[PDB]
Design a protein around this ligand. Structure first.
Ligand SMILES: CCCCCCCCCCCCCCCCCC(=O)OC[C@H](COP(=O)([O-])OCC(O)COP(=O)([O-])OC[C@@H](COC(=O)CCCCCCCCCCCCCCCCC)OC(=O)CCCCCCCCCCCCCCCCC)OC(=O)CCCCCCCCCCCCCCCCC
Ligand SMILES: CCCCCCCCCCCCCCCCC[C@@H](O)O[C@H](CO[C@H](O)CCCCCCCCCCCCCCC)COP(=O)(O)OCC[N+](C)(C)C
Ligand SMILES: CCCCCCCC/C=C/CCCCCCCC(=O)OC[C@H](COP(=O)(O)OCCN)OC(=O)CCCCCCC/C=C/CCCCCCCC
Ligand SMILES: CCCCCCCC/C=C\CCCCCCCC(=O)OC[C@H](COP(=O)(O)OCCN)OC(=O)CCCCCCC/C=C\CCCCCCCC
Ligand SMILES: CCCCCCCCCCCC(=O)SCCNC(=O)CCNC(=O)[C@H](O)C(C)(C)COP(=O)(O)O
Lengths: 220, 111, 459, 67, 88, 104, 128, 62, 124, 175, 178
């Protein structure tokens, strides 16, 4: 299980960093995260895998919803090469996608931190295959890589879409849906973590450099 | 009678009502998507209760409510596990589904 | 059980004395009533059988088969009157007579207490089927199909008769109760081996066994709709009934005489499932699916364990219903476009939505979607086989994949895509066809509700 | 809410959507900063990691290479 | 809702807009019936560039076998009107 | 059928076939819901070499890392009541050999 | 100059990379003209019936009938027993049977031998 | 008319389900099983009224 | 880690084996060693049904934490002191395990060097 | 409730701790429980009281059927068909009863496993041992008969086992 | 899609097609607009450098080498328009396309609604029926003895004629039917 998860997450993250369809990038991110869950199952933390599933549902669904809003606005276009500057054209969609990408990449104290940080720190502190450890670290870096790829090519720069601009996200249904999933992706990690019994034994003693390893590789 | 079991079973039961109503004069009107969304939202708010019960007392149950068949020494019954995983996963899926249906009401308007 | 036999014998003159425009109505009504009456045979015991007289008896294995036959007759009546509209009155009465005679023979076959009367009726079922296929078939190939249907069966069944009478001279009886209570083991000799082969080959060819199945695509494709329906749904199950009956006197030879047949059955279900993937004929695909399912049933019977027997009975019933439904569904399209090629008329979900729904349901039931009784039978057989040998789960697993593929393949090619441009004679579905599909499909799910009724006497 | 095509101009934006976007970004950042100020040890660790080299032999209990 | 009901007048204005934005074509001389080769003095590469410009403007690809035939803005207007089912 | 020209006005657009032309023997395997033989940007047998090399390297490295695992410089976890003898399977009538742990 | 592309069965050669297209002859042009003439004649024949107001039903396509008949009914009349045919038939029809027979017989023999010595761990094996 | 949805889609199914569970399903042994509640030192049992002692004079590593 | 680099690249003979530890008797160098005690009884741990892994030497702090979490249920921020106490006990247990591993390392290296020196002295 | 025998299906005394609120904040669960009680439980109980009152007004009984014991297969002549018939039917009835005994023990084991929670490996040993014993005896009695099983096959299997155990005991005595 | 194809592509057609494909794939490589304009002007100059080659053999050799360079340097994932044969919405709306002859089978109650539409539909049917024979006769006269040599069809020339084989071209379902 550990080896299968490690190869899955590394390969999918390596594939995702060069895709041009936004939906394909998001799908490959889901596949890599499933590989990570299989990894954490392989080192005997099933409750961590369940917690990660619960945390991942929120921001993954909301990332897909932001992608769908972008697609519908730009006359059913999915290629990131034809999306220009939507940071100012799409305030709410940009903010939602930024929060989602930060939560996916384990920004501390967001919903993704409370599972991914523990998973990485528990993989580091275990009698485990070294190759799987290395591939897990490289995969968690490539996660940040494809997240910033999506952000850079979708929101920054000058427009590249056809000149008949039909951008409009001012619809109550879309706004309410993404707002609900945003509240979830911001607060659900803390709310759920502080409300379950302790089903694991914590790693209270860590070398200082190994405590921030996920943060370091994400920044890199 | 420890509403845990009744509430957790009604949570799943109330999701099947729109399937039954899919042959009435509501599946042919433009109010069907909102009706389904409201049903899912109500199911989520109802399933929020067993989660609070589990967080409070760690309460867990199994419900073997219908005996389907019995082989010679093997008995098959319609049984449900309402442990930590079920009571924690059901509300999350219901919340995500509610938000997705509300989004689809606008995304899929021209279908 | 003369209360069921006599009403069919009375169906005969009622049909032959009805008015020229009321034959179908009277036949359908009274066949449905007879099915309702025959539904009372399901009240079975847990220890022994219902011994009505010295001639007839019912077990928990034969009662669902009788109910299936009685229910099937009106379905063939409904599906037949479309293409027989231009036929004359006397020929229509003869067609209904053929169907009624086939039902009577099958009903008396499934309940004979003695093996030789069972033999007589189980050969007597051959005549109406051959007449139907060779007279009311559509293409020129039907004649050849009839021949392939006849001798393939007879070359298997003529040795059996010999063995049967031989047994009567050694044990003194062919009554099934005496045979069961006075069973004795079979020694390891060549004479016993050939007695086993003679007793087994008839029911093997009836299933059919892989390598002995060439007659089945011909018979099932060249026949009319009622002929194909009764061939797939009921007549294939005679082999299963006969083998589950006769295996009581063949132990312990089967312990090693099942090996070639088990190998043939497993590799042949693989081969026929693979054959289904490249089939330009829509009816041939259904015929080969029938072959694969019957191969599974053969494996189940040859294993000789209670779970395998229950799975075999459930799969027999479920396959009968599903295959009959699939044949009717294909026949609707054939009646529309007058061709059996699968890629001719496409995109029919656009033009016929409810028929597309029926197609989807039939395809889902074919590939053993839980909790359908197809899945129950398949899973019981797989579990018994895994107990028999752990490696079987490979081959069976392979089958569980390939089936689904070709199943969806058929659906995706006939209902999905874009419609053919030059075909413009596709009329909306009639009430008759929709009612036919509904009456095929609803009993399947009703049986899913209460599946103990079709699990056999091993329950 | 009626918004119309612009043809090579920046699209029309209503004040409400910008207000909502700025608000949600601000609350996310406030949550992060507040949780760091109050729950710092979750990122920097809580208990000092020892170094095995500075452990004396007496508490450790091995002989001075003679017995 | 979705995009407005594109009309012939809008299509003609967009085509003329794209063409007048070309440095090799003078605006005052250009008319709706002007010939790219004869009246405007361009070559085949320029016509290909013009076709790509219209593809980018309207967001749908014109096949090469159809693109080579179009020679005046009126032809392009007619082709785009036929492709998008425009009758008013 | 995926290789055929999609911009031509075929009689059957979904199959990309014309009425009356000869049909390939293996059309049902090439219906473009199925086996595709279109040219690739990278040549065949160069894709095969890279895919096989990646898989082989991954398998070998997983094996090597299995024979060179990663662990912390710590001792085994210590369990109080005779390595939890009773809790891990009962057997209360055998007096298991004592498992003793000491302070450090 | 650049690395070359070599075709295969499942990834063929592009039309723009085919040397046979970059050296033409008037014979090639004539052949292309005949090909277009045949295609156009067939297209006219199809379109004449396709647009007929009085046509109801299916336009019969002889090519489809030929394909189906060749795939199903024409195979046996054109079959001959050759060393290749006989060898392939024997292999593909017999080898799997005896392979699976050996596999299953060996497995069952091992299982029965283990049962006889009394070491198979058959505890709780009530159903079979 | 206003809040009739919560009656016909929540109240009636829950009435039927509770009736079925409390009067039909629980009429047979081992159909609804709950794991034993957690007991901790210093807790009082409801039925017997007994108390469970404290925990061995904590070392107080304050 | 550096211990992996030392064992896998350097001399593996004087590096401890995690699966086989300890090798030396527990009272080898120590004159007397106090027996490690428990606070939680088997019946208490069974009634609390902690887990088969949480029934370590820090189980009593865990039981206290579970009690406080149950009592102060809706206020899920009130269980701070006991959580820290349990974490501190777990940290001390990990420090004890680190001491055990390092003692194994130093003892193995010391014994191996002493044996080699004794062999050298007997070799001359 | 009294519907089933408590000795065939035993349970421990069901100890539950008393509430100890340690927080000022109101417990939502108790408020929602009171609401559910007053709104759902009360209506159902009244309807059941009505239905029970209606049932008690028309009370009738059904009886469990008793079967005598007839001569077994061992006391059966080789070709005495009537005696073989009665012995066979008795054997089938006993087979069904044994299956139900195994089912009862399995139900006990499942209930124990779910009830004991995290301590099931240690707290459920007695039920596991009971199931092991009953399954061993049942497997000795009835397994490997195959389909077409009968009383004669069971008798032959038993005789084979008794011959084997007699030989084993005699050989062990000779040691 | 609307034009009848020819027997072969000539040299200039092949060069223009290579020009368009190279420009599109360079646009795929050059995401940003200014960089694309730079390299597209460079590519246009490269193309027109040999524009005045009178040796057809050397022109074909240059075209060949250009095609090999393109196949080596093409984008593995070029941009495709959503409704183009490789697009994400290529055949999305085909399941909503229903032929017009289906309206012939509507129940009289279904035809009771929309009376004016069915009156106009009867008008169109009468026009098609009245024009069919004239179209057929015109096609026969214009067509060569040895069958047609292209797929191109003739227009109307007479007083009230209609272009032959028009019914299924004019009565297309729609691009966005439902
Ligand atoms: C789980 C749901 C619970 C619901 C409770 C109530 C369900 C009652 C169902 C009874 C059977 C209904 C009749 C079936 C034939 C179709 C009739 C028809 O023509 O409809 C047109 C009618 C009118 O619509 P229209 O405008 O004409 O549309 C026509 C167009 O073509 C447009 O067509 P369309 O797009 O509407 O297509 C029809 C639609 C629906 O059509 C169907 O699929 C009908 C057949 C269902 C599947 C059959 C194949 C598999 C066989 C499994 C056997 C299960 C038997 C269950 C017991 C049956 C007892 C009678 O197709 C599908 O949705 C795909 C079905 C895929 C099934 C996936 C789930 C697999 C089984 C799941 C487990 C089931 C048991 C759950 C409990 C287990 C323990 C907790 O539409 C409807 O009436 C609504 C159809 C909704 C069907 C729901 C399918 C799920 C339920 C399956 C069985 C439920 C058993 C109930 C007891 C509890 C279990
Ligand atoms: C195309 C599909 C149609 C259906 C096919 C049906 C398959 C029927 C096959 C019959 C299965 C077994 C038949 C005979 C039983 C054993 C076979 C033999 O190989 O076993 C050995 C037999 O040994 C030798 O093989 C002797 C037989 C050799 C001659 C038999 C002819 C086999 C050649 C293959 C012909 C293919 C038959 C099918 C034609 C279509 C056992 O050794 P032995 O202990 O001594 O004999 C046991 C019997 N005793 C105890 C009385 C002594
Ligand atoms: C493990 C048990 C089984 C092992 C696998 C055996 C191989 C199975 C081969 C099945 C052959 C199927 C033949 C008929 C299928 C229908 C034809 C078909 O689907 O066409 C292929 C169709 C079209 O291709 P696209 O890429 O989608 O093109 C889209 C753009 N044009 O795509 C497919 O469906 C391909 C499916 C074939 C996959 C077969 C390879 C699977 C290999 C699995 C091995 C790995 C095992 C992992 C073990 C996990 C560790 C515990
Ligand atoms: C509908 C609204 C009607 C409102 C009035 C009803 C209110 C409650 C009345 C109770 C009726 C009496 C009653 O239910 O008694 C229980 C009675 C007898 O108990 P059994 O377990 O079935 O006995 C063993 C034989 N099988 O059972 C029943 O009849 C009710 C069963 C309904 C269960 C809910 C539906 C589940 C079935 C779905 C189909 C699933 C397919 C197969 C699943 C396989 C799973 C392994
Ligand atoms: C993304 C990476 C891939 C891109 C790489 C592509 C590299 C290709 C670059 C090299 C291509 C060449 O120069 S090959 C240049 C070939 N030269 C000739 O054929 C000369 C004869 N002239 C003509 O045929 C016409 O004048 C014509 C030129 C067609 C104009 O037509 P019009 O005036 O009537 O429009």
């Amino acid at each position: 299980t550990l080896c299968l998860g490690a190869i899955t997450t590394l390969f999918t993250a390596l594939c995702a960093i060069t895709q041009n369809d936004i939906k394909k990038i998001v799908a490959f991110s889901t596949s890599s995260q499933l590989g990570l869950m299989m990894v954490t199952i392989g080192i005997n933390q099933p409750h961590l895998a369940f917690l990660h599933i619960c945390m991942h549902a929120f921001f993954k669904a909301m990332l897909f919803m932001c992608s769908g809003s972008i697609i519908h606005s730009l006359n059913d276009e999915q290629d990131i090469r034809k999306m220009g500057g939507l940071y100012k054209a799409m305030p709410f969609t940009t903010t939602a996608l930024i929060i989602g990408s930060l939560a996916l990449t384990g920004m501390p104290y967001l919903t993704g931190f409370y599972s991914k940080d523990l998973i990485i720190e528990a993989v580091n502190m275990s009698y485990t295959n070294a190759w799987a450890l290395l591939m897990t670290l490289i995969a968690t870096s490539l996660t940040a890589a494809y997240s910033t790829r999506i952000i850079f090519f979708a929101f920054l720069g000058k427009p590249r879409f056809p000149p008949l601009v039909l951008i409009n996200e001012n619809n109550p249904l879309l706004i309410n849906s993404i707002k609900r999933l945003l509240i979830g992706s911001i607060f659900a990690g803390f709310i759920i973590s502080n409300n379950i019994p302790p089903m694991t034994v914590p790693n209270t003693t860590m070398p200082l450099y190994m405590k921030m390893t996920a943060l370091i590789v994400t920044i890199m | 009678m420890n509403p845990f079991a009744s509430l957790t079973l009604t949570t799943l039961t109330i999701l099947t009502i729109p399937i039954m109503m899919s042959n009435s004069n509501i599946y042919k009107t433009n109010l069907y998507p909102n009706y389904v969304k409201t049903t899912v939202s109500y199911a989520f708010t109802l399933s929020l209760v067993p989660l609070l019960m589990f967080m409070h007392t760690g309460q867990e149950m199994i419900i073997s409510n219908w005996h389907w068949m019995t082989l010679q020494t093997v008995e098959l019954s319609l049984s449900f596990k309402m442990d930590y995983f079920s009571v924690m996963f059901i509300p999350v899926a219901l919340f995500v589904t509610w938000s997705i249906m509300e989004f689809s009401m606008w995304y899929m308007h021209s279908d | 059980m003369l209360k069921i036999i006599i009403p069919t014998t009375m169906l005969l003159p009622m049909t032959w004395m009805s008015k020229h425009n009321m034959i179908w109505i009277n036949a359908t009504v009274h066949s449905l009533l007879i099915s309702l009456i025959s539904l009372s045979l399901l009240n079975q015991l847990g220890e022994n059988s219902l011994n009505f007289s010295l001639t007839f008896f019912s077990d928990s294995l034969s009662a669902p088969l009788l109910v299936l036959t009685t229910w099937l007759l009106p379905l063939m009546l409904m599906a037949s009157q479309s293409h027989l509209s231009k036929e004359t009155t006397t020929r229509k009465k003869l067609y209904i007579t053929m169907l009624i005679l086939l039902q009577l023979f099958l009903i008396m076959t499934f309940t004979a207490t003695e093996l030789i009367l069972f033999y007589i009726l189980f050969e007597a079922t051959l005549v109406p089927t051959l007449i139907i296929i060779t007279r009311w078939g559509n293409q020129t190939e039907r004649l050849n199909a009839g021949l392939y249907f006849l001798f393939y069966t007879l070359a298997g069944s003529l040795p059996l008769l010999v063995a049967l009478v031989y047994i009567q001279n050694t044990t003194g009886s062919l009554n099934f109760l005496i045979i069961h209570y006075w069973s004795h083991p079979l020694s390891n000799s060549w004479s016993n081996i050939f007695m086993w082969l003679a007793c087994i080959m008839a029911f093997m060819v009836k299933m059919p066994l892989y390598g002995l199945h060439l007659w089945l695509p011909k018979a099932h494709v060249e026949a009319p709709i009622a002929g194909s329906m009764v061939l797939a749904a009921v007549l294939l199950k005679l082999g299963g009934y006969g083998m589950m009956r006769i295996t009581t006197i063949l132990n312990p030879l089967t312990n090693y005489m099942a090996y070639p047949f088990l190998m043939l059955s497993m590799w042949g279900m693989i081969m026929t499932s693979s054959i289904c993937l490249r089939q330009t004929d829509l009816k041939s695909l259904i015929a080969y699916s029938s072959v694969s399912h019957m191969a599974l049933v053969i494996v189940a019977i040859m294993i000789q364990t209670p779970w395998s027997f229950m799975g075999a009975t459930a799969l027999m019933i479920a396959h009968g219903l599903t295959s009959s439904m699939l044949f009717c569904l294909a026949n609707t399209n054939y009646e529309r476009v007058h061709s059996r090629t699968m890629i001719l008329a496409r995109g029919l979900q656009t033009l016929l939505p409810l028929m597309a729904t029926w197609w989807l349901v039939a395809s889902l039931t074919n590939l053993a979607l839980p909790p359908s009784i197809n899945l129950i039978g398949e899973l019981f057989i797989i579990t018994a086989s895994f107990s028999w040998s752990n490696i079987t789960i490979i081959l069976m697993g392979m089958n569980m994949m390939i089936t689904a593929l070709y199943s969806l393949y058929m659906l995706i090619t006939t209902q999905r895509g874009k419609y053919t441009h030059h075909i413009n004679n596709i009329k909306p579905s009639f009430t008759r066809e929709n009612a036919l599909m509904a009456l095929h499909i609803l009993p399947l799910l009703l049986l899913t509700l209460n599946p103990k009724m079709i699990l056999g006497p091993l329950y | 809410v009626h918004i119309e095509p612009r043809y090579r101009q920046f699209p029309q934006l209503t004040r409400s959507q910008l207000i909502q976007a700025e608000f949600f970004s601000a609350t996310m950042w406030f949550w992060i900063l507040w949780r760091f100020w109050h729950d710092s040890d979750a990122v920097l660790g809580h208990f000092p990691y020892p170094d095995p080299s500075q452990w004396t032999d007496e508490e450790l209990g091995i002989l001075p290479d003679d017995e | 809702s979705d995009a407005p009901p594109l009309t012939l007048e809008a299509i003609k204005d967009r085509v003329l807009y794209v063409l007048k934005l070309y440095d090799k074509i003078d605006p005052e001389k250009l008319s709706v019936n002007s010939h790219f080769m004869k009246d405007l003095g361009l070559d085949s590469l320029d016509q290909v560039e013009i076709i790509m410009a219209m593809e980018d403007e309207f967001g749908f690809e014109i096949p090469d076998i159809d693109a080579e035939k179009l020679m005046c803005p009126q032809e392009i207007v007619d082709y785009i009107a036929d492709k998008k089912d425009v009758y008013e | 059928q995926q290789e055929r020209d999609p911009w031509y006005d075929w009689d059957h657009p979904d199959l990309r076939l014309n009425w009356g032309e000869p049909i390939h023997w293996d059309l049902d395997m090439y219906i473009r819901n199925r086996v595709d033989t279109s040219p690739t940007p990278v040549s065949w047998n160069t894709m095969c070499k890279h895919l096989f090399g990646f898989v082989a390297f991954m398998l070998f490295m997983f094996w090597v890392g299995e024979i060179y695992p990663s662990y912390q410089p710590v001792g085994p976890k210590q369990y109080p009541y005779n390595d939890l003898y009773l809790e891990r399977g009962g057997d209360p009538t055998k007096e298991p050999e004592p498992v003793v742990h000491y302070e450090i | 100059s650049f690395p070359k592309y070599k075709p295969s069965r499942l990834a063929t050669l592009p039309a723009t990379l085919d040397p046979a297209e970059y050296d033409i002859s008037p014979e090639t042009r004539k052949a292309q003209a005949e090909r277009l003439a045949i295609r156009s004649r067939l297209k006219r024949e199809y379109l004449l019936q396709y647009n007929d107001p009085n046509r109801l039903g299916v336009i019969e396509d002889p090519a489809l009938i030929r394909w189906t008949y060749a795939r199903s009914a024409n195979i046996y009349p054109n079959f001959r027993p050759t060393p290749k045919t006989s060898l392939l038939g024997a292999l593909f029809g017999i080898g799997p049977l005896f392979f699976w027979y050996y596999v299953f017989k060996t497995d069952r023999d091992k299982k029965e031998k283990l049962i006889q010595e009394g070491k198979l761990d058959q505890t709780f094996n009530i159903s079979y | 008319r206003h809040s009739i949805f919560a009656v016909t889609h929540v109240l009636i199914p829950v009435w039927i389900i509770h009736y079925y569970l409390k009067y039909h399903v629980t009429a047979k042994p081992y159909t609804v099983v709950e794991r034993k509640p957690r007991i901790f030192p210093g807790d009082t049992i409801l039925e017997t009224g007994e108390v469970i002692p404290l925990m061995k004079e904590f070392p107080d590593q304050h | 880690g550096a211990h992996l680099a030392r064992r896998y690249l350097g001399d593996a003979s004087k590096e401890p084996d995690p699966l086989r530890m300890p090798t030396f008797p527990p009272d080898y160098g120590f004159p007397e060693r106090k027996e490690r005690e428990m606070v939680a009884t088997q019946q208490e741990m069974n009634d609390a049904q902690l887990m088969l892994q949480q029934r370590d030497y820090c189980a009593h702090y865990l039981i206290q934490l579970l009690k406080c979490k149950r009592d102060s249920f809706p206020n899920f921020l009130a269980c701070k002191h006991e959580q820290h106490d349990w974490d501190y006990c777990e940290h001390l247990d990990y420090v004890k395990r680190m001491k055990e591993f390092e003692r194994e390392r130093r003892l193995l290296q010391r014994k191996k060097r002493r044996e080699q020196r004794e062999a050298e002295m007997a070799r001359g | 409730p009294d519907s089933w025998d408590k000795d065939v299906y035993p349970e421990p005394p069901r100890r539950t701790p008393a509430p100890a609120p340690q927080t000022s904040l109101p417990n939502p669960v108790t408020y929602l429980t009171k609401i559910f009680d007053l709104l759902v439980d009360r209506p159902v109980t009244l309807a059941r009281e009505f239905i029970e009152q209606q049932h008690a007004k028309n009370r009738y009984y059904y009886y469990h059927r008793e079967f005598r014991r007839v001569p077994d297969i061992t006391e059966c002549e080789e070709k005495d068909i009537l005696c073989m018939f009665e012995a066979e039917m008795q054997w089938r009835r006993d087979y069904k009863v044994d299956q139900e005994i195994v089912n009862i023990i399995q139900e006990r084991l499942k209930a124990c496993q779910q009830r004991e929670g995290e301590s099931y490996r240690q707290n459920c040993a007695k039920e596991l041992e009971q199931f092991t014993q009953v399954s061993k005896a049942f497997q000795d009695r009835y397994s490997d008969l195959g389909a077409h099983y009968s009383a004669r096959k069971c008798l032959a299997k038993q005789k084979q086992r008794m011959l084997a155990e007699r030989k084993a005991a005699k050989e062990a005595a000779a040691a | 899609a609307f034009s009848a194809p020819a027997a072969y592509l000539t040299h200039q057609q092949k060069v223009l097609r290579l020009y368009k494909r190279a420009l599109r794939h360079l646009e795929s490589w050059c995401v940003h607009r200014d960089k694309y304009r730079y390299f597209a002007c460079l590519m246009r100059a490269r193309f027109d450098e040999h524009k005045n080659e009178k040796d057809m053999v050397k022109a074909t050799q240059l075209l060949r080498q250009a095609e090999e360079e393109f196949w080596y340097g093409q984008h593995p994932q070029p941009y495709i328009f959503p409704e183009s044969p490789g697009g994400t919405s290529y055949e999305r709306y085909e399941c909503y396309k229903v032929p017009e002859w289906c309206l012939d089978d509507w129940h009289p109650s279904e035809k009771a609604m929309y009376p004016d539409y069915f009156a106009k539909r009867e008008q169109w049917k009468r026009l098609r029926r009245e024009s069919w024979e004239r179209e057929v006769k015109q096609l026969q006269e214009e067509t060569p003895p040895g069958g047609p040599r292209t797929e191109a069809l003739p227009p109307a020339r007479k007083e009230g004629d209609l272009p032959p084989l028009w019914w299924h071209i004019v009565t297309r379902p729609r691009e966005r039917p439902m």
